[PDB]
Design a protein around this nucleic acid. Structure first.
Ligand SMILES: [Mg+2]
Ligand SMILES: [Mg+2]
Ligand SMILES: [Mg+2]
Ligand SMILES: [Mg+2]
Ligand SMILES: [Mg+2]
Ligand SMILES: [Mg+2]
Ligand SMILES: [Zn+2]
Ligand SMILES: [Zn+2]
Ligand SMILES: [Zn+2]
Lengths: 36, 229, 129, 175, 61, 146
RNA sequence: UCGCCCGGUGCCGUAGGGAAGCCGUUAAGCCCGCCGCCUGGGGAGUACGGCCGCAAGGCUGAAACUUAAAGGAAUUGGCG
RNA sequence: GCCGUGCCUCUGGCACGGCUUUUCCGGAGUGUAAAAAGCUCCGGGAAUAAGGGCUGGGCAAGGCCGGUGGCAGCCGCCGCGGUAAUACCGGCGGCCCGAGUGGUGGCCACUAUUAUUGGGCCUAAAGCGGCCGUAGCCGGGCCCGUAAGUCCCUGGCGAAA
């Protein structure tokens, strides 16, 4: 997914393993719900 | 040139020397500034310099480069400290740079000025530029460079009449040593004046590590220490 | 692999003399290497040198005097006109006659100070000071 | 491309508020009584161009560079700024107060024709002096050497009579 | 200022490189002879390089 | 890392290409060659513009501050856009009335953006009804058209 | 069991380099080569297009706008 | 505007005496295709002629007085204001340029923040997960030729501004 290790640093954010999983769900909804 | 020659006589009498060099200077065995250096002695009394180079404390051969105040934390507040950076030198061939600390601005300046005298060095001057080919001790005889911390400094010879085109603090140091014309090229962070000052000091010291033949001397005008006061 | 037997020599010389050595061995020995040693000698930078044959291209023994600050190779080997020397002398050397700049002129190898007397040019190969 | 533009013949300072320089220029303006600052930077530039010329004919060598070398000495001493024995290396130790000494104002004052320095300006601007049989009305004019002795009052000026009430206050200072 | 060779600068007796103002050099009279003064620069003392007296032949540290 | 990539004598083409390739990782150059400022700019490469005011508003200042800065909504003439502009001076807003023509300059901030504690505003008013505003604020001149 | 030469694998360490932590002939030293990538923090590894995969997914990859700091190596304390 | 002498806060302001006429008003020549400007001469008169921005640090200049009270407002950046403001608004002092002096937009330097001269890639942005190889760039020692690259001398050219 071409990610950058600056974001696994957790200081003022949430975890990135869990932002990935949430971007993937939207990239799905834009695909099925008439992504054609 | 006398007002600083009764100062020498006054100090040379009520001073009880405690090291070997002091004994030598008091017994008249050592009688010129130029013969305490290239021998591996140690200089721990400031009165070796108030007697051999008396005009180093002339209030226009002195300079206070910066004053800062710094802090350390404790369960009862902030403990504050000063930091003065000072340089001294006769404008003929000799320069020194020291720092010194204290709780007040007055004690800190005294220690700065004191330690500047013990960290003194002598240099070489000449004329090595392509434009001005005179033979006069007014600039640096060739390209030299020195470093400190994160600052890199280079000095290049320049023609007679051009000012000293270097930063804001380099002028004081380079002018107390006797130079009057130069060019410059810098890298690193020049806004930490301690490291910038110590880089310029290191360059002026490195002036005398370059191997040179006896024919270059009567081509660039190289003088060491005083050059006909 | 190996690409330049002259650069290796000049870096070896300036690395050895900086720690105090008094003899070096320039292993792969061209005759360009020998020709540049010849002009590093006449200006008083090295002592005496000899060519030892070992069956495979020969070696060079050279004694140092501790009289050089820096030596190196001008690599891309630019060409110079016979009236454009100062532009390069202001880039490599530290004052207006400090040291030599070695030039591969059409009449052999020589320092730029003897090229300007005949008024010729060529490729710059190295510099010593 | 674009055609020729006419350019300024002086240069301003790089920073406008350096203390050790405002202090140095505040003296040259009261001693010679120049009108504004742009009148002072013009003379600095007149000197810096000479200096920058001597730096190039000093490294250079060739046939015509020689010819350009000895045209700089010839004029530079025709203007009174060098003596008749000077070599090229003496161009590099020339000062600003050497060019400020050649204005017509300072010369008509250093010859006793005016009582002070702010009066010589009026004598020049109102047209009483003359330079070589010729009224000139510009105080910043640089006087050459072959004619710094042929300077008087105009033939048709009230000052050209040693009985004027205002000329009699001028020679009252020369003793 | 009365320049009749006002002074000279000392050189190391092993490499011939003159000595900078504030380094940890040394000098002493030649052991075994007593007639020559011997100089050693800081970098020839640090890596123990041999010297030899210019009068007799006594060598090394 | 090694020495540096194309340091050969007959490698001019590759060296020029590497430079032209990495010059596009810039932002002052890409933005000057693709001309991205125009095509998104309500004033269209002008130093000034003119509009007609729709309503008068008040903005809240930044966090380590307090107070309300007065401004107006201008409706440009060459475009038809609607921008938000700031009225500089002590009591200036009492001289701006609706259905007035105003002249608009930038506000002079970093990179051309905004300045200080008024964070979203990027224009300021200079002239009202062909009469400068600076004068009106300090007496010295009277406002035409009522 | 001891000594030596060549090639691998570890540690303490001179000169030197570095912002320091520390590297130091198994370099992060001084040189000669070739290729790949970087250009303040976010928006964003996103939108739009293309090529692969049975799908999950991989690879390529901007701008409107917004912000004055975001990052690193070490000090004195306060605390668990 | 200049000069002289006195008084005072002394860099400048005043009171007395004198002088000049670039500029200003009248007038005669010269000038111009005709005019006008300009230039040489007469007669009056110190008479007709100084603004703009700044005043906390960067950055030259005030710890002076009256207003306003986290409200009005200032601020390129850092930062001021809560009833004791050298930072806002007025008075009076002072500083920088001066027939100019400030505001908004664009390009260059600043910037070694585009790096051939001349930057980076362990921990700060950044070495492809690893390896094989086609084009291209880089290539070991000596001897004999050629003269394309390269270097020196010389004819014809690269308009004027
Ligand atoms: Mg005020
Ligand atoms: Mg100040
Ligand atoms: Mg960088
Ligand atoms: Mg990283
Ligand atoms: Mg070969
Ligand atoms: Mg032409
Ligand atoms: Zn010189
Ligand atoms: Zn030695
Ligand atoms: Zn001996």
């Amino acid at each position: 997914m071409k990610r950058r290790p600056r974001k696994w640093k957790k200081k003022g954010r949430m975890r990135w393993k869990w932002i990935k999983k949430r971007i993937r769900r939207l990239k799905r909804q834009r695909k099925k719900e008439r992504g054609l | 040139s006398q007002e600083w020659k009764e100062y020498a006589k006054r100090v040379l009498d009520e001073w009880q020397p405690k090291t070997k060099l002091g004994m030598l200077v008091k017994e008249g065995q050592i009688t010129d500034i130029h013969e305490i250096f290239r021998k591996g002695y140690q200089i721990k009394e400031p009165e070796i310099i108030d007697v051999l180079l008396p005009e180093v404390n002339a209030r226009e051969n002195q300079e206070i480069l910066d004053i800062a105040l710094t802090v350390r934390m404790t369960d009862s507040g902030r403990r504050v400290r000063f930091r003065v950076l000072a340089a001294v030198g006769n404008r003929d061939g000799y320069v020194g740079l020291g720092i010194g600390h204290g709780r007040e601005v007055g004690i800190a300046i005294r220690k700065a000025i004191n330690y500047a005298k013990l960290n003194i060095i002598e240099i070489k001057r000449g004329c090595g530029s392509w434009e001005c080919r005179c033979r006069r001790p007014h600039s640096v005889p060739f390209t030299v460079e020195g470093k400190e911390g994160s600052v890199r400094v280079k000095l290049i010879p320049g023609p007679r009449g051009l000012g000293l085109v270097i930063g804001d603090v380099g002028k004081k140091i380079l002018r107390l040593a006797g130079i009057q014309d130069v060019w410059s090229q810098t890298l690193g962070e020049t806004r930490t004046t301690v490291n910038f000052a110590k880089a310029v000091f290191n360059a002026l010291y490195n002036t005398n590590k370059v191997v040179v033949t006896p024919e270059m001397i009567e081509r660039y005008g190289i003088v060491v220490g005083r050059a006909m006061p | 692999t190996l690409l330049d037997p002259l650069a290796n020599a000049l870096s070896h010389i300036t690395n050895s003399e900086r720690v105090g050595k008094r003899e070096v061995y320039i292993k792969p020995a061209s005759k360009l290497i020998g020709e540049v040693l010849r002009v590093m000698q006449k200006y008083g930078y090295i002592g005496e040198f000899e060519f030892i044959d070992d069956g495979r291209a020969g070696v060079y023994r050279v004694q140092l005097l501790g009289k050089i600050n820096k030596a190196g190779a001008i690599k891309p080997r630019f060409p110079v006109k016979a009236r454009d020397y100062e532009r390069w002398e202001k880039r490599f050397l530290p004052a207006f006659e400090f040291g030599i700049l070695i030039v591969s002129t059409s009449q052999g190898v020589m320092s730029h100070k003897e090229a300007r007397e005949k008024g010729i040019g060529g490729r710059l190969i190295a510099y010593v000071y | 491309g674009d055609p020729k533009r006419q350019r300024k013949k002086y240069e301003t300072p790089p920073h406008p508020w350096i203390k050790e320089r405002l202090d140095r220029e505040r003296v040259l303006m009261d001693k010679y009584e120049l009108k504004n600052k742009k009148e002072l930077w013009k003379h600095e530039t007149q000197l810096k161009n000479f200096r920058r010329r001597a730096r190039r004919l000093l490294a250079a060598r060739g046939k015509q560079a020689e010819i350009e070398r000895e045209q700089l000495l010839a004029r530079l001493k025709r203007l009174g700024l060098l003596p008749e024995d000077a070599v090229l290396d003496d161009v590099l130790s020339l000062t600003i107060e050497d060019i400020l000494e050649r204005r017509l104002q300072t010369i008509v004052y250093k010859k006793g024709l005016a009582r002070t320095m702010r009066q010589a300006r009026q004598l020049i601007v109102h047209g009483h002096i003359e330079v070589n049989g010729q009224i000139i009305r510009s105080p910043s004019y640089l006087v050459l050497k072959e004619e710094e002795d042929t300077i008087t009052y105009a033939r048709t000026s009230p000052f050209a009579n040693p009985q004027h009430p205002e000329r009699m206050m001028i020679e009252k200072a020369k003793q | 200022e009365n320049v009749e060779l006002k002074f000279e600068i000392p050189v190391c007796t092993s490499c011939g490189r003159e000595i900078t103002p504030r380094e940890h050099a040394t000098h002493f009279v030649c052991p075994n002879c007593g007639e020559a003064i011997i100089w050693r620069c800081e970098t020839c003392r640090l890596l123990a390089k041999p010297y030899k007296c210019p009068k007799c032949g006594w060598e090394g540290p | 890392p090694g020495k540096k990539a194309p340091n050969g004598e007959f490698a001019g083409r590759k060296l020029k290409l590497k430079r032209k390739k990495f010059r596009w990782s810039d932002i002052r150059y890409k933005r000057r060659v693709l001309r991205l400022k125009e095509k998104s700019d309500p004033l269209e490469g002008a130093p000034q513009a003119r509009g007609i005011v729709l309503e008068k508003i008040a903005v809240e200042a930044k966090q380590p501050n307090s107070g309300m800065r007065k401004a107006v909504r201008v409706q440009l003439i060459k475009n038809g856009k609607v921008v938000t502009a700031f009225c500089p001076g002590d009591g200036a807003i009492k001289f701006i009335d609706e259905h007035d023509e105003v002249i608009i300059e930038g506000i002079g901030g970093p990179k051309g953006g905004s300045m200080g504690d008024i964070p979203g505003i990027r224009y300021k008013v200079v002239k009202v009804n062909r009469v400068s505003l600076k004068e009106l604020v300090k007496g010295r001149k009277e406002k035409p058209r009522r």
